[PDB]
């Protein structure tokens with residue numbers, strides 16, 4: 001029942017803070033820093049999820065399943081957003097800004113590194129606004145695991161698509177409030193959602209890369225933070 | 228790119244590839260691998276008729292096909308299997324259900340993902356005009372050159388909106404259904420990645436795709 005501006009305001013206030021890395025740089029300790037960073041970010045990510053409108057209306061089981069499917073996607077689009085204003089670099093933390101040459105120590109790391117840089121350049125070429133970013137991240141949370149889940153499950157898939165419908169209206173309204181014609185509204189909406197296909201592709205490579213090095217957050221852990 | 232929305236639909240509808248034709252578990256993957264191998268030629272023939280595709284360089288043409296070939300095979304399978312609930316219609320003489328995929332490690336996980344996609348198509352009542360547009364977007368989005376690809380992608384988006392507006396939908400329903408269609412592409416890319424992993428437990432070579440394009 002939230003208006004478009006009420007949906008934007010709720011998503012902007014639910015935004016998690018930018019976390020930092022340990023202060024006191026070696027390429028040998030890089031992965032320990034990034035693993036520790038992602039671990040701390042996940043706790044704030046679950047707090048943000050529980051404040052995306054309509055997310056806590058679902059059962060905890062489906063809340064867990066949605067985060068199981070989208071947690072790496074959400075970390076990646078967050079990284080890409082933080083790195084948007086720093087070409088050729090990924091801003092994992094304000095005190096942890098890495099270029100492509102430092103991502104060569106691990107085999108297969110640079111392939112995902114270049115993919116993350118390309119998405120960051122894509123966001124840059126579009127002048128993606130923060131209000132559109134929080135909408136795209138909310139879509140990732142609800143859509144990534146809605147096709148891989150009884151009448152209870154049918155009722156909740158219907159609710160997820162209802163919430164996704166409001167986020168779509170919110171994006172359209174944001175593009176209308178900004179002065180875009182109708183053709184530019186539908187075209188930019190399509191442009192944004194098509195990027196989500198590549199973020200999923202990046203997430204699938206990240207998962208594969210992490211398995212070649214306790215990779216996933218467990219069901220009981222995701223449930224413990226959610227509950 | 229100068230075509231109208233109605234001319235865009237007609238071009239894609241006539242470019243649709245034909246339905247190819249194809250008992251033990253070991254012979255099952257034999258038939259599936261053989262079927263996909265024969266379908267790739269007709270998929271490339273379909274790609275050449277997607278408006279704006281042949282304006283790309285041959286190098287970029289191949290790269291787009293390398294990137295999208297498994298997604299296009301899957302979304303065409305989901306479209307064929309749409310009115311066969313719980314089953315996957317690989318070929319008219321090759322209709323498989325869930326049980327026939329349990330004998331292979333990691334097959335039922337993907338079989339279920341394809342069936343969930345076909346179930347999503349039924350709930351939305353996807354039309355053939357929308358299907359050929361979703362297939363065209365997969366080809367151009369999966370992989371001067373980037374500017375032209377984005378112009379054709381924006382062209383297919385205009386054609387989709389035109390189809391929904393012609394069907395009497397309000398604008399709210401128009402951009403809602405557009406969003407629902409494009410969010411399925413994320414899951415299709417997911418299935419393609421999971422399918423690639425399962426198949427490697429494959430990829431058409433550059434030279435092979437180039438030969439098929441003349």
Ligand SMILES: C[C@@H]1CCN(CCOc2ccc([C@@H]3c4ccc(O)cc4CC4(CC4)N3C(=O)c3ccccc3)cc2)C1
Nearest residue numbers: 034035037038039075076079109112113206214215216217
């Ligand atoms: C159960 C816990 C929860 C997951 N933990 C297990 C570790 O998973 C992780 C998850 C993420 C990252 C890291 C990281 C950190 C923060 C961020 O905002 C974003 C990212 C992004 C990224 C995946 C791309 N990453 C990379 O390093 C990396 C970048 C380029 C190419 C190769 C890799 C590290 C480890 C255990």
Ligand SMILES: C[C@@H]1CCN(CCOc2ccc([C@@H]3c4ccc(O)cc4CC4(CC4)N3C(=O)c3ccccc3)cc2)C1
Nearest residue numbers: 259260262263264267300301304334337338422429430431
């Ligand atoms: C260069 C050549 C080009 C590809 N070749 C290498 C073989 O890759 C392939 C590609 C496709 C399939 C098959 C197939 C056939 C026709 C179709 O329309 C669709 C599909 C779909 C699919 C990938 C999902 N598949 C399945 O069986 C299968 C279904 C459920 C769960 C697990 C698997 C077989 C093998 C080499």
